[PDB]
Structure formats: C-alpha cells, structure tokens
Design an enzyme around this catalytic site. Structure first.
Site, PDB file in Angstrom:
ATOM      1  CD  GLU A   1      -3.162  -0.528  -0.056  1.00  0.00           C
ATOM      2  OE1 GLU A   1      -3.120   0.597  -0.562  1.00  0.00           O
ATOM      3  OE2 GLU A   1      -3.960  -1.417  -0.442  1.00  0.00           O
TER       4      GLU A   1
ATOM      5  CG  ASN B   1      -8.136   7.147  -4.951  1.00  0.00           C
ATOM      6  OD1 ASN B   1      -7.199   6.395  -5.190  1.00  0.00           O
ATOM      7  ND2 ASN B   1      -8.559   7.366  -3.716  1.00  0.00           N
TER       8      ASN B   1
ATOM      9  CG  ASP C   1      -6.445   5.584  -1.278  1.00  0.00           C
ATOM     10  OD1 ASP C   1      -7.629   5.860  -0.985  1.00  0.00           O
ATOM     11  OD2 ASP C   1      -6.154   4.745  -2.143  1.00  0.00           O
TER      12      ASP C   1
ATOM     13  CG  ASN D   1     -10.986   6.544  -0.417  1.00  0.00           C
ATOM     14  OD1 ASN D   1     -11.332   7.719  -0.281  1.00  0.00           O
ATOM     15  ND2 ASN D   1     -11.083   5.906  -1.573  1.00  0.00           N
TER      16      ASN D   1
END
Ligand SMILES: C[C@@H](O)CN1CCN(CC(=O)O)CCN(CC(=O)O)CCN(CC(=O)O)CC1
Ligand SMILES: C[C@@H](O)CN1CCN(CC(=O)O)CCN(CC(=O)O)CCN(CC(=O)O)CC1
Ligand SMILES: [Cl-]
Ligand SMILES: [Cl-]
Ligand SMILES: [Cl-]
Ligand SMILES: [Gd]
Ligand code: NA
Length: 128
Positions: free
Chosen positions: A35, A46, A52, A59
């Site tokens: 991640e 995004n 994120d 998120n």
C-alpha cells in the site's frame, strides 16, 4: 516515517492488530508494504477526487476529513493529516473499523492481489 519490517510488526502487534477479525499479523505487514512501502507520509489521488492517506492508504471518501472531498463521510472522526503521523495509533483504530464492516481485508486492493492466498507468515519471519 519509513518503518522497518520487524519495527512495524511489533507496533501493529502492541496495538492489537494481530489476528484481528482472524487476520494473522503477516496479512497486515504484507498490506502496509504494498500500500505505502512502510511510509506513514504516503498519499495517492484517486480519479473520483478522494485521496488515500498513510501506511494503509485509508480513503477520504468514507473514513476521514481533508476538506476537499465534497459530500463525503468521516466515519473515523479524524482529519486525514492524523493518518500521516509517525505514531500509527490513528491508522490502526481506523483500520479496525474498516476491516469489521463486511468486506474484510478485500478493502485493500494491494492485499487482495499480492498477499491473499500467499505465505503471509514470511512477512514476520526472523522478528523477535
Ligand atoms: C536484508 C537484505 O535483503 C538487504 N538488502 C540487500 C540487497 N538485496 C539482497 C537480498 O535481499 O538478498 C537485494 C535487493 N533487495 C531485494 C529484496 O529484498 O527483495 C531490495 C533492497 N533491500 C530491501 C529489503 O531487503 O528490505 C535492501 C538491501
Ligand atoms: C531477495 C529476497 O529478498 C527475496 N524475497 C523473498 C525473501 N524475503 C527476504 C527478506 O526480506 O528477508 C523474505 C520474505 N519477504 C519479506 C520482505 O522481504 O519484506 C516477502 C517476499 N519477498 C517480497 C519482496 O522482496 O518485496 C519476496 C522476495
Ligand atoms: Cl502471520
Ligand atoms: Cl471534504
Ligand atoms: Cl473476513
Ligand atoms: Gd523479501
Ligand atoms: Na471525508
């Protein structure tokens, strides 16, 4: 902060993450590696306009407030910036709520595609 492998495992394990909702400690260290690269300051935009945040890339659509994701929810009741701390408390309590909500660790796309069905115990091998 860029965490080492054993150092992040002993932090996660002291904050109760080990076998949380039956997910062994190797699953969490696996997710963090793919991640964020163990980096607490990591951020990614995004295409819907959310972002994120932190070591588990949580998120801003549902979980935290950054003041630029319109008509979004803040279910962890924190600022996004709190999840960028060298202290991983905020992120851990916030990931306990997410993994409890019906879909498990499938919320983490990097967990689903790179750690699910593999030898996850390899991620804590050697650590005291
Ligand atoms: C402990 C050593 O592994 C340290 N290491 C020595 C060099 N290694 C040789 C090897 O990994 O046997 C090759 C490169 N290595 C590949 C990989 O590890 O997957 C990436 C860099 N690593 C990252 C890490 O290992 O945490 C740090 C440097
Ligand atoms: C060259 C080796 O580094 C090969 N390496 C396998 C052996 N590694 C070595 C170690 O890090 O001690 C231990 C297991 N490892 C934990 C981790 O590394 O973080 C996860 C799997 N890795 C993933 C990756 O490298 O990103 C596969 C490649
Ligand atoms: Cl494990
Ligand atoms: Cl907002
Ligand atoms: Cl589950
Ligand atoms: Gd490795
Ligand atoms: Na939000």
């Amino acid at each position: 902060k860029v965490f080492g492998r054993c150092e992040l495992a002993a932090a996660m394990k002291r904050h109760g993450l080990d076998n949380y909702r039956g997910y062994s400690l190797g699953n969490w260290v696996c997710a963090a590696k793919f991640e964020s690269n163990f980096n607490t300051q990591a951020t990614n935009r995004n295409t819907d306009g959310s972002t994120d945040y932190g070591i588990l890339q949580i998120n801003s659509r549902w979980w935290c407030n950054d003041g630029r994701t319109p008509g979004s929810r803040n279910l962890c009741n924190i600022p996004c910036s709190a999840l960028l701390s060298s202290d991983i408390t905020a992120s851990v309590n916030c990931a306990k709520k997410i993994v409890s909500d019906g879909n498990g660790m499938n919320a983490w796309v990097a967990w689903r595609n790179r750690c699910k069905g593999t030898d996850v115990q390899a991620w804590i091998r050697g650590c005291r």
